[PDB]
């Protein structure tokens, strides 16, 4: 088939409240082939402890993954989702943003 | 119950003549219920009820069957693509399982893809090549139908007999653990600018099950034309997340709200009032 670059969507599970714990989600979908590097980031560094689903795939056969971890949002702290894949020349970073719908 | 499906997903990545990786999981509709330990070749039961009503004896036999199938698949494929076939690397996907339909017979299926393209599927007693994937699919199907003839009967019985019986047990075992209705939380935020003289409002609805949901922006009892539902995305443990946005021009008056209807709520809609500015940055 044709290689397909991943789509990346980032969102929190609960309303964001500075100093209150929450869950950060990153949904990576629509990609092919399956070799992928997804990391959740706190201030640019990979969070060592995350939860992730196994690989699944749609019926067009493209793959998707869900990542999530606990986190505490903050004025200073930047949280993000980083993805590398063969269709990408360098890692793509999608930041989490409250003042936007993380849209 | 209604239409409900159980799927075993497998992904085989062949990197060279000496290296391949297998990966696999089991899914009850959109909830992952099983994993596969690729290091020791064993089934991972992700929930307390993931064994359904099967005995340890039955599941031991199934685990052995899976090992035999996976080792034999790897061995055969690697044997047939030797040394310098420019196919490397390549990847094989397998989707196998069953569906229950209320009042009708179950369905079993076993579908294969090569490098993301339909390759072949199993049709009751025969491996049938996809009319789109040509010569390779025909050659694979020749081998499966003529050489490994004496395992067709296994695959059939696995997907059409064993799978429905297991799914029925799994559904029954989950009843002491899993929710058939989960209520969502909801909250308001702004979004990115849709354009000069305009702003965007976002209604977040998080953690609801099952999937059907209704969300609209409102001025009192009047539903707003600009309402737009985003894509529905997964959360942990088979629940769902949704964003409903509204584009607002400078001059819109205070008094907008978001209204959420869901079966888990049953007559008490969530209503959230926008208490921020309506002046676009
Ligand atoms: C990555 C793996 C998947 C991930 C797992 C995830 C966990 C999993 C979701 C847990 C859920 C379990 C539910 C209940 C599963 C419900 C049904 C499923 C839909 C079916 C999917 C079809 C499967 C995948 C393909 C195997 C068929 C193969 C072609 C047949 C093998 C033929 O081998 P065989 O020759 O017939 C022999 F039997 F082995 C012989 O037996 C002798 C023993 O005494 C031995 O000594 C002899 O030498 C000889 O080996
Ligand atoms: C203990 C079980 C033993 C085997 C397990 C069952 C797996 C059997 C699957 C065999 C697949 C072999 C693929 C062969 C691909 C091939 O032969 O390619 C043909 C080319 O010649 C195209 O022209
Ligand atoms: C095959 O690929 C694996 C994984 O990259 C590598 O470790 C191994 O050296 C390769 N084997 C050969 C013979 O090139
Ligand atoms: C050259 C590699 C061909 C890929 C073979 C895939 C066949 C999978 C069917 C296995 C069912 C038992």
Residue numbers in the entry:
A (entry chain B): 1 to 103
B (entry chain A): 5 to 285
Passage from the reporting paper:
Whereas mice only express CD1d, humans express a functionally diverse family of CD1 antigen presenting molecules, namely CD1a, CD1b, CD1c, and CD1d. Here we focus on mycoketides, a class of mycobacterial lipids presented by CD1c. Certain T cell responses to MPM require both a phosphate and a β-linked mannose unit, which protrude from the ligand binding groove of CD1c.
These synthetic analogs comprise a carba-mannose, where the ring oxygen is replaced by a methylene group (MPM-1), and two C-mannosides, where the anomeric oxygen is replaced by a methylene group or a difluoro methylene moiety (MPM-2 and MPM-3, respectively). To accomplish this stabilization, Phe72 adopted a g+ conformation at a torsion angle of 89.6°, compared with trans in the other two analogs with angles of 171.3° and 181.0° for MPM-1 and MPM-2, respectively. This suggests that Phe72 played a role in the orientation and presentation of these ligands to TCRs. We also observed a considerable movement of the CD1c α1 helix in the CD1c-MPM-1 and CD1c-MPM-2 structures compared with the CD1c-MPM-3 and native CD1c-MPM structures, with up to 2.1 Å difference at Leu74 Cα, which appears to be ligand-induced. Of the CD1c-MPM analogue binary structures, the structure of CD1c-MPM-3 most closely resembled that of CD1c-native MPM. Protein crystallography demonstrated that the phosphate group of MPM-3 was highly stabilized in a configuration comparable to natural MPM, which was supported by the difluoro methylene group. The difluoro methylene itself was turned away from the CD1c surface, which may be the reason that it does not interfere with TCR docking. In addition, the difluoro methylene causes no significant change in pKa of the molecule so that it carries a negative charge under physiologic conditions, like natural MPM. Overall, these results show that the analog MPM-3 is able to withstand processing to PM, while remaining antigenic for the CD8-1 TCR.
